Amino acid sequence: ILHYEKLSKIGLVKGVTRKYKIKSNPLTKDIVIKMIPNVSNMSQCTGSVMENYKTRLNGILTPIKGALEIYKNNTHDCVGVCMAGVAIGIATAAQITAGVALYEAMKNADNINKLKSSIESTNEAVVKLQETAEKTVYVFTALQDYINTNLVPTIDKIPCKQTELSLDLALSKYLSDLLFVFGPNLQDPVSNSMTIQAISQAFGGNYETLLRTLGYATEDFDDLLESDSITGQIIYVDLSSYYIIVRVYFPILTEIQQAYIQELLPVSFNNDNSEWISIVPNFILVRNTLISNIEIGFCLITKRSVICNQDYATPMTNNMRECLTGSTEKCPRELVVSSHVPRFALSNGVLFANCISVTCQCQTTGRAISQSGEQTLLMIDNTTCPTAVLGNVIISLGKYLGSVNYNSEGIAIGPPVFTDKVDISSQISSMNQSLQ
Amino acid sequence: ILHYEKLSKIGLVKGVTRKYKIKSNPLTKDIVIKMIPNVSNMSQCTGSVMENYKTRLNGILTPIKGALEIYKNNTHDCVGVCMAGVAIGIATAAQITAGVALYEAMKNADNINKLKSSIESTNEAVVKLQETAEKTVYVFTALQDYINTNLVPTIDKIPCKQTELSLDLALSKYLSDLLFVFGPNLQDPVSNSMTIQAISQAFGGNYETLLRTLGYATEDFDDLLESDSITGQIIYVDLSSYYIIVRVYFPILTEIQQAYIQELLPVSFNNDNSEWISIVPNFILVRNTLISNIEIGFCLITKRSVICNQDYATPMTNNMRECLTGSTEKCPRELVVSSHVPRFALSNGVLFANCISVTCQCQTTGRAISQSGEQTLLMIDNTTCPTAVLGNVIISLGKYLGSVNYNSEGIAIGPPVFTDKVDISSQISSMNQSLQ
Amino acid sequence: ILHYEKLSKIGLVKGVTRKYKIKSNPLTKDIVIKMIPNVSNMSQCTGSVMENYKTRLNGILTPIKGALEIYKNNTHDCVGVCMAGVAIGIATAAQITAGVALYEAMKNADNINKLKSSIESTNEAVVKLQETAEKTVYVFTALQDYINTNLVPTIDKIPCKQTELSLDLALSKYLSDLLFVFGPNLQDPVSNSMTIQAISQAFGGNYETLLRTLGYATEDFDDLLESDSITGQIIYVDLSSYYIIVRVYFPILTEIQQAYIQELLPVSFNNDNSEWISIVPNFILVRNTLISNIEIGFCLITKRSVICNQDYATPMTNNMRECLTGSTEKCPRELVVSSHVPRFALSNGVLFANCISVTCQCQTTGRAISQSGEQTLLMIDNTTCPTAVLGNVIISLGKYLGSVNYNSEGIAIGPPVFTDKVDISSQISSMNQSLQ
Ligand SMILES: *[C@@H]1O[C@H](CO)[C@@H](O)[C@H](O)[C@H]1NC(C)=O
Ligand SMILES: *[C@@H]1O[C@H](CO)[C@@H](O)[C@H](O)[C@H]1NC(C)=O
Ligand SMILES: *[C@@H]1O[C@H](CO)[C@@H](O)[C@H](O)[C@H]1NC(C)=O
Ligand SMILES: *[C@@H]1O[C@H](CO)[C@@H](O)[C@H](O)[C@H]1NC(C)=O
Ligand SMILES: *[C@@H]1O[C@H](CO)[C@@H](O)[C@H](O)[C@H]1NC(C)=O
Ligand SMILES: *[C@@H]1O[C@H](CO)[C@@H](O)[C@H](O)[C@H]1NC(C)=O
Ligand SMILES: *[C@@H]1O[C@H](CO)[C@@H](O)[C@H](O)[C@H]1NC(C)=O
Ligand SMILES: *[C@@H]1O[C@H](CO)[C@@H](O)[C@H](O)[C@H]1NC(C)=O
Ligand SMILES: *[C@@H]1O[C@H](CO)[C@@H](O)[C@H](O)[C@H]1NC(C)=O
Ligand SMILES: *[C@@H]1O[C@H](CO)[C@@H](O)[C@H](O)[C@H]1NC(C)=O
Ligand SMILES: *[C@@H]1O[C@H](CO)[C@@H](O)[C@H](O)[C@H]1NC(C)=O
Ligand SMILES: *[C@@H]1O[C@H](CO)[C@@H](O)[C@H](O)[C@H]1NC(C)=O
User: Fold this and answer.
1) What are the residues whose beta carbons fall under 8 Å from the beta carbon of A94, sequence distance 6 or more?
2) Could you say which protein family the record assigns here (chains A, B, C)?
3) DSSP single-letter state for residue B154
């Protein structure tokens, strides 16, 4: 376990405790995104912009169909999914799993494609199609709202050459937004790591409409959405009607048993007439009594749980392990030169303040609280005095659950470090000479 | 303090000198952002979209008020702001300061909330309300412009079922834009480090309107705005009318006395029949004769000053200070293999170039400029000849201010390094292996 | 030169082979971007917003003209381009080259400026003007389409105070979008490294319209566009009509002879009853039998080529070069702690899998595939059994081309490493302590 009391003297005050959960057991739903709007009522003087747009869009969608066909031509049934690796050549585990999912989805994709005329005939942003007697499929058109709201009502009040230019500009804007996702960046359409937010770029970035139409099945919807857990996969691309079929995955957030995330608050501390800040990860992941780093940039942090779409646990150095489990001397530290580093923190009702680097007096005492040159931090609870003053904040404090004689006991202190990108090169290069 | 001559002989040509500026003394103004538009004039067939949007927005905003209420409950002027830390539990210095500011703003927030009916009744993008007999408050409604410009005029030209769909799509787009900032990502709404641009996402990202309506208080407006110095804080959330109160901070740019930013220009140089580029920071902070690094990626680099919303000074390795103070050998270098690395530079009118890599000839005599094999760079000035050429550029040069015999004196050059992400891991691994 | 067979035993399975191509031989086109829209037809109720917008835009643009005038006043024909470095002061190689290009473009800029009245009289998003008897120039207005589609048609259906507010909001949104690029961030406007997508932010981000109107005539267009290969440069700023002149560069992709990019697929492998992953870059660049790294994150990855707007070759550690050329023991490895690390891969129809972590039972044999406690990965080809099963995927396999005794030969393995930044700091600091 983590030794919070020893970490506090370093400057690492214990923070909130959060539970760890990852995506599992995804459900599947199929949607059709029509990437070309219907212009039946505006065709009177739509000009020649549509042929150019179709050619440009075919130039984008052709690589997608080409990258799908390699798995399409190698997936079939033999006397489950039964693939042929000779004509596949290069494939990772994720690619092969995505191909299996693609073949599985083809069973419904065939019946979806059976309604090609209905898909093309759609002229609203969201349309319901009776895909079978007991199931339905929704159709999303990229720019149908804009055409039905702005361009169509203004088809005669302005010279419709200007309307042609406006439609061309709208389509060009849509394509420029698309090219970030569906352009040559999408080298691997056979994969399910593409988030619904990115897929909605084919719909103008309005993923909320897609999710609301499909259904808010769970109460953990927002955590799944922000954490990039709701993903989709393209399973069919049509170069005649210019539409794609996307299978959207709706997973459930499953708590990881015997696992939690502990956050450590860094506080500057005094040592040798100078201020220092400890260098340890802000978030530590504990799972089944095993301490390991978690890369938290991709994960989502809430008030009670950490939500990740993938198991983002990363290895932790053994020295870091002993720094977090009591051995303070192995805990690295950095000198502080900036004057905007926190100098006190409150945890469990008791504040850990660097009472020498900031004015520090209590309230009922009406006197100052003195921090000697040997103590890194000062523990202030209501044992010494029940209300403290720090700058312009007057705060009352609760009892401490740790050692009664905390402020009278010191510890060893670790060696200094520097964490700049180029400082790493200098340190490695310099000591290499020392090694020789 | 920086030895520019030796740095140039390394390949680090002295660049522009800029002053250091940080924000301080922030003035405060209060604005109200209503996140639900008024649909009174278009409620004839808006449908059930409004109730669903209200439910979604209530779900979005409930955690915000839940987090604010933790502090709002435990701060009550007692026998200055006087907070109870027992029920706060977990808090940092910045969070406690933000809570103090929140309570201070509550005194005016009470009078602002006294105008709940007026805030609800707003039907314009920007509305002026008399806070007091002398003070006024501006109300910003997110989608009011869109509704009043598009949905109201086109309320009967199109079937209003389509209008309901259009309004639903617009609100969904608004919510998708919001969820980046106001969604579960906003775990800590108490803190006041959220930029005005991010807050404007609740107003469609149009922070320029927010700032212009309040007032361009100073000529340093753009530097403050880009550097993220203009920040806001949510001080009250109402779920009955779905609006928030934001206290916008307008700091002033105060230059730090006896401090400046020095920029070094890297130039590839010849050494041992090959090309190298020195590995040192592009920007160097000198403050009160103390040299320190600066994570300038978060700051703004203008022509005459560096603007930072916080003091971003970070420590610099001692060896690196020795390198910048004259110790040539302690500066690391990287072998260059790219052919698109700069090979000459101009400072104070004197030309530093690597004539081995790029051909140099001098126009006033029409003969080549020769760089010998043991010289890193060639200093070319009008002392040598008034005009030299470099490929297709003909340039005239001033006089050097350093040593007259610059080109005849050599230095000691540093040790090679590699700066790739995996190179660090490989170097550490081998360097451990040698020690064992 | 790369020993794929030995890399497979580590877990680095050979992937796709791509060709390396860079920007070269850029063509030049001239366009005019007018950042103030023509509002002649809305002048009845335009209000006073236009004067304030003009003042804001003048404040935005004055630094740009000030920075251009440094090279404008210091460049003239001398008895090619002939610059004066005395009054330039500070300049890099890129800045000087950009200034030379700026002067070269001034010849056409004068003829463009001769049509100032025509430029300022434009009232459409894209307008064609004849700068000479033979050549023509296009004009792009930032917000003309929005005005002519929304504000003009709605000039009487709603009170024009609302129209004035709407125009002010639109201009403020346009300025908010602009300030990310054309604001104080644009410290060097002379340089030509700014992408066309960024330049289009002055046109609403519709770079597709610019490129389509300019008449592209290449099959490598999408690769050039994604890779940020198409760039522009501002060559003149007018503070009276508020327009800028941009010289757009259209290059050609030239394949680098004797150069290709090799991709390596990481696969978790068993060692000492534990699962590990190798720390080696995903992409390796080979040029004339010289191996080098590449920050391919800046580049674009396609199915058969890597496209970069600059030569992004970076040096590689010598030990690392030995690692990629058969010396297996120098390759670092990291202990897999997550349960979402790939565990099998397919290359050339040959399946590399870690049968310890994932059960393998190939259907043709009808029995499970057993991997011992000495073999890092198990090679499956149709010699041992044609079709293999891994979980839910049934795959048929080709024949190996390397050693037929692959599964019986073992290799040496490397030392463990950790890649976290804090882990790097802990590692570096710790062995300084042991070194002494
Ligand atoms: C378009 O034309 C059809 C007739 O084919 C008509 O039913 C419909 O109302 C028109 N408008 C829209 C928005 O579809
Ligand atoms: C897949 O098969 C189709 C015909 O069924 C063919 O047109 C296409 O080129 C094939 N794709 C390959 C072999 O990659
Ligand atoms: C300190 O505060 C706790 C509540 O947090 C209280 O129970 C205890 O009596 C207090 N001790 C004093 C006032 O001495
Ligand atoms: C390495 O150890 C020496 C011991 O004297 C110390 O002075 C130096 O600062 C240390 N450097 C690093 C980068 O750990
Ligand atoms: C470390 O020093 C040795 C001997 O001086 C040298 O051979 C080796 O290349 C150095 N390693 C570096 C600088 O990474
Ligand atoms: C704050 O106080 C109110 C009213 O007493 C209560 O409803 C709410 O739950 C409290 N919130 C806390 C204690 O976090
Ligand atoms: C709604 O209509 C009334 C009718 O007089 C008008 O006064 C009011 O300004 C309208 N509201 C909006 C927001 O347009
Ligand atoms: C050389 O350049 C200097 C500027 O540094 C100038 O003052 C001088 O007149 C030039 N010509 C000489 C020194 O002959
Ligand atoms: C350049 O010259 C013009 C007059 O020709 C002057 O107005 C401007 O200020 C000069 N700029 C600089 C940087 O000297
Ligand atoms: C303004 O109105 C005139 C009236 O004839 C028209 O010719 C011109 O095109 C209009 N300007 C526009 C639409 O930008
Ligand atoms: C393995 O597959 C290849 C074609 O990929 C075939 O030529 C060979 O005969 C097969 N070997 C066996 C034993 O079936
Ligand atoms: C250094 O090598 C030793 C060899 O026994 C190993 O135990 C230790 O973990 C290594 N540490 C680092 C930071 O590489």
Assistant:
1) A191, A193, C342
2) Belongs to the paramyxoviruses fusion glycoprotein family.
3) T
